[PDB]
Write a protein that binds this DNA or RNA. Sequence first.
DNA 1: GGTCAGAAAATCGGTTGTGGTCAGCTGCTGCCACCGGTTAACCTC
Length: 76
Amino acid sequence: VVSLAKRYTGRGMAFLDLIQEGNLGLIRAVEKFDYTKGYKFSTYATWWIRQAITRAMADQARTIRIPVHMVEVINK
DNA sequence: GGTCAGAAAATCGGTTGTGGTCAGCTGCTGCCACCGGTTAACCTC
């Protein structure tokens, strides 16, 4: 999750917030994982980690909070 | 060459009445914000 989180430098927060959001995503994925998938755990959890990091970046991006749909159209 | 009495003001105050108008109230009308499922795009088991 450190190697996954390293691709989000310079976007609002420092690295540590991304690291801890990746830990949160790891907790959510390891709750939401099944052993009869026959899937690699990291390849499973990458979507969850990236989702958590991106939504926390959306939440804590700016001084004034902006809703995620306007964040999306700002990105667009 | 007086003398109550009536008619008719105005004046404060009810009244009725009624008409309307608007504050608001509130169940449809419909649009608008997350939520996530899916669907064609990248890296090579």
